[PDB]
């Protein structure tokens, strides 16, 4: 149990994911109720089942792939997955765009360069746009600049 109770999440054992505690099973003493449980010793690995596809309800009509992956995973397994089981060929350019997510302010000249040049470099070389997945900020500009070109 965490000393600092969260906002409406006071029942949280320093992680509080979905339970009165931070556990998906019985919160047994396990013969040792170690205070400040180490992530290496407390957290374990279960096989994944949260894979599949997603379709946004009414926002779009195409299908999108998604996979839930562990914190520590060899990159060979992920690459083999995306090549064989996802039908993605070897790329030619790997551009990684990152920036402010929640508090981002931009000038129109700044917006134009994303509107044009990133799309031009993406659609000629057949690059791979890799970025964070969230609904705020520069990644939203990237998403709109990639949907409007399509």
């Amino acid at each position: 149990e965490s000393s600092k109770l969260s906002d409406a999440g006071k029942v949280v054992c320093q992680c509080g994911y979905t339970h009165e505690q931070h556990l998906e099973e019985a919160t047994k003493p396990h013969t040792f109720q170690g205070t400040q449980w180490d992530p290496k010793k407390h957290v374990q690995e279960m096989p994944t089942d949260a894979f599949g596809d997603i379709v946004f309800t009414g926002l779009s009509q195409k299908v999108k792939k998604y996979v839930r992956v562990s914190q520590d995973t060899p990159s060979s397994v992920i690459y083999h997955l995306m090549t064989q089981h996802w039908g993605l060929d070897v790329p030619n350019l790997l551009i990684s765009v990152t920036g402010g997510a929640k508090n981002f302010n931009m000038k129109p000249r700044l917006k134009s360069i994303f509107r044009r040049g990133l799309v031009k470099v993406a659609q000629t070389t057949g690059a791979w746009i890799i970025t964070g997945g969230s609904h705020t900020g520069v990644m939203k500009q990237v998403g709109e600049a990639v949907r409007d070109f399509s």
Binding site: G58, L59, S60, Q61, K111, K140, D148
Partner: protein
């Protein structure tokens, strides 16, 4: 962002409808434009139709039974 589009329907000016009230953070929730898509379809005003098509107004679930019943009561 609904009142601005209601006004922009009556302006008959596309670039003003595009230049500020479609460049900021537009809350998508595409059901907003159905009362505006109907006005654009009725007035004709055919140009706003395309503009709303770039913004994800998919016609497959936009056209309801009651929407078409209302549309057919406003013929030329």
């Amino acid at each position: 962002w609904d009142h601005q589009l209601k006004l922009a329907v009556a302006w008959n000016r596309v670039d003003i409808a595009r230049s500020e009230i479609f460049m900021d953070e537009w809350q998508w929730k595409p059901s907003d434009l159905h009362p505006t898509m109907t006005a654009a379809l009725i007035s004709n005003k055919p140009e706003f139709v395309k503009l709303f098509l770039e913004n994800g107004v998919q016609l497959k679930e936009f056209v309801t039974w009651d929407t078409l019943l209302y549309l057919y009561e406003n013929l030329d």
